């Protein structure tokens, strides 16, 4: 199934595809795209300045939701 | 046996307790893994380390064939 791109910007704004998301809404927005298929590949991209704490907060939300196929892009 | 790669806020880097830089990291790692590319590499970093830095390190590991990466 079609991969989803999650983008985090320097302002810490976050997007699933083009949809603005936050930690509390990201899994609902993602499930709209994946129809709950946990084998869908998630590609994470971030502005060069985004820090590791932010990255890990996003990764943990995906992980606790069962989205385990993650690729980092840069 | 897994290896821990640490990146600190000042961008200093370590393989185990061994200081490394991007140009020496793979030699230092091979000394621990004996070249076994299925060895798990755990990446840990200070909260303020930037994504650019993380990706420079990930790319060096990746181009060397170390593909089993866990973020901590």
């Amino acid at each position: 199934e079609k991969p989803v791109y999650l983008s985090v910007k320097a302002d810490n704004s976050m997007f699933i595809g083009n949809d603005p998301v936050t930690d509390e809404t990201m899994i609902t927005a993602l499930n709209a795209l994946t129809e709950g298929k946990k084998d869908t590949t998630i590609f994470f991209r971030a502005d060069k300045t985004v820090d590791y704490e932010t990255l890990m907060k996003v990764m943990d939300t995906l992980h606790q939701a069962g989205y385990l196929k993650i690729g980092l892009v840069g | 046996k897994p290896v821990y790669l640490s990146v600190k806020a000042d961008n200093s880097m370590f393989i185990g307790n061994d200081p490394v830089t991007d140009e020496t990291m793979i030699t230092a790692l091979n000394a621990l893994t004996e070249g076994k590319k299925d060895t798990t590499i755990f990446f840990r970093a200070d909260k303020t380390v930037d994504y650019e830095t993380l990706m420079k390190v990930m790319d060096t590991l990746h181009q060397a064939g170390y593909l089993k990466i866990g973020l901590v």
Partner: peptide, 9 residues
């Protein structure tokens, strides 16, 4: 509690 990642290029 690690997260596994691939890097893509």
């Amino acid at each position: 509690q690690p997260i596994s990642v691939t890097m893509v290029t």
